[PDB]
Amino acid sequence: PTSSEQIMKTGAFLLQGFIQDRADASTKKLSESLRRIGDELDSNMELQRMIADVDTDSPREVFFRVAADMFADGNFNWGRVVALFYFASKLVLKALPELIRTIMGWTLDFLRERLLVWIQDQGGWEGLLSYFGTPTWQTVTIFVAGVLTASLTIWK
Template sequence: MDQAMARRTGGGLIIPEQIMRTGACLLQNFILDQVRQAGGPVFEMSQDAGIKMLVQILKNITQDLDNNKEMQRLIVSVKDKVCTVAVFFQVANQLISEGITWSRVAALFYFASKLVLQALHSGMPEQIASIMHWTLDFLRERLLEWIQEQGGWDGLVNKYNDKFKWLTVAMTIGTCAFFLIRRLANLG
């Protein structure tokens, strides 16, 4: 494999195909989670711990986008039009117009999930596959090289996981304490 196909970062080979496979799985699971949270049907999601962690990180990053006026304006601008690949790419390009960051990659996934929800609510589920393809095409054409330079999806974990690690630790301790107290109460 030549250097054009894979870059050496962090001691490992980050292969574009791996980034795209993980990106596709992450996109699907993030969208399924957003659909479930919106009261839609519950679908089986990946049980892969890495994908689950990436979905949780994206959710944490995007949790405030429901209140972001600019993001909501972009979503409404698409809602008023027939969503085509050209319209999708126009909005996606606006999302990264000031540079690529993990927050903007997360915003792209959020945007795609909102389009999927609109398609479901509008009775046009056939658009879902198109939205997924457009998102992955944009990821491949505009974001892949940047993600590769960051060390692949591990770069997202490395940047944000420490911020959420203590929250996870606190939740785990709280859950353990709850079950311990409950168990002790049942013994008495």
């Protein structure tokens, strides 16, 4: 649950499950709530414009500095993790097989290197269900879009 092994395994499934959309009961609830936020984010034309306004050449550079920017204050919140996974899945489209593995690899690297301890401090990925368990949880979209927009600006 809070073990790093499980957190990486679960993160891998949630990301794989996520990317396969743009292309037990508690974890299904996460998959589906991420999906819904993804669907709404995909309707934000300002956000999709910015994600198109970024050089797909050298994906490793843009992925990692975007991810580092969202987390440059040394703090954590689930909206930033949602933004990261969403941006990774958009990079898969912006360049497309092995691309999927590579970007998942970069993302998994960032999670292990930077997010692991925070997610442990949340009780694991169960924390993300807490983040989703509110009234009007769908307005979390506005927040995740904001986090993504600020991070593409510096790049842009």
